[PDB]
Amino acid sequence: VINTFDGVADYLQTYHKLPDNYITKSEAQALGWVASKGNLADVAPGKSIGGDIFSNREGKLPGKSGRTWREADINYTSGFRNSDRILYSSDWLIYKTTDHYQTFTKIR
Numbered sequence: 001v002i003n004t005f006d007g008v009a010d011y012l013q014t015y016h017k018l019p020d021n022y023i024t025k026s027e028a029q030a031l032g033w034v035a036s037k038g039n040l041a042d043v044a045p046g047k048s049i050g051g052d053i054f055s056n057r058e059g060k061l062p063g064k065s066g067r068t069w070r071e072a073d074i075n076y077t078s079g080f081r082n083s084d085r086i087l088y089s090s091d092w093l094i095y096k097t098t099d100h101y102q103t104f105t106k107i108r
Contacts, residue, residue: 003048005074008086009094009108016092022050022072041078048076054087060104067091 002011002019011019023031023044032043040047050072054061061069067089074084074096087095087104094108 001046001048003074003076005084005086005096005107008050008072008074009096012086012088012094013092013108018050018072021046021048023047024051025049035081038080040076040081049073049081050086054101058101060101061087061089061095062093064091 001021002008003021008019011017025033028040028044028047028049033040040049050070052071054069054071056063056069069087069089071085071087073081074086076082076084083098083100085097085101086107087097092108094106095104096107097104
């Protein structure tokens with residue numbers, strides 16, 4: 001799997017998409033994922049949550065008309081979800097957070 005910052009940042013840009021290890025929260029839920037049980041590993045082995053819309057409500061990420069943001073979980077392997085996320089825009093700007101969407105730094 002490609003679940004590393006560099007790994008996913010590189011891929012996004014090569015293919016313009018997430019590696020196939022990602023599944024959205026609503027997809028994850030349909031397989032039996034319960035956030036409270038930390039069971040993702042069980043129900044969707046080798047999968048990580050990603051591809052959902054990052055609303056960017058706090059205005060922390062560069063805004064623009066017709067620029068949509070999205071997120072994906074980084075460094076996840078099992079149990080409860082961590083605090084690393086990659087944020088990629090529709091014009092393929094990539095940012096990272098390691099604190100829960102509190103701080104963002106440019107990676108690509």
